[PDB]
Amino acid sequence: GGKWSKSSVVGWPAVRERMRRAEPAADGVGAASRDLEKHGAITSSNTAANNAACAW
């Protein structure tokens, strides 16, 4: 199926440090309904202008 001879390079194991344990919290909130809904609940659409997102 072709797609032969291919490889990648460089990496960034920064999250590996904070992701090692997780987050020591007592009865808090992980997301809104399940998990993705917390981040999925974000609607930002700007026309033209500059620097999308990070606004409203």
From Swiss-Prot:
Keyword Secreted: yes
Record's comment describing the protein's domains: The N-terminal domain is composed of the N-myristoyl glycine and of a cluster of positively charged amino acids. It is required for inner plasma membrane targeting of Nef and virion incorporation, and thereby for infectivity. This domain is also involved in binding to TP53.
Included range, full protein: 2 to 57 of 206
Descriptive protein name: Protein Nef
Organism, scientific name: Human immunodeficiency virus type 1 group M subtype B (isolate PCV12) (HIV-1)
Location of this chain's protein in the cell: Host cell membrane; Virion; Secreted; Host Golgi apparatus membrane
Residues the record marks as site: Might play a role in AP-1 recruitment to the Nef-MHC-I complex: M19
One term of GO molecular function: CD4 receptor binding
Ranges that cross the membrane: none
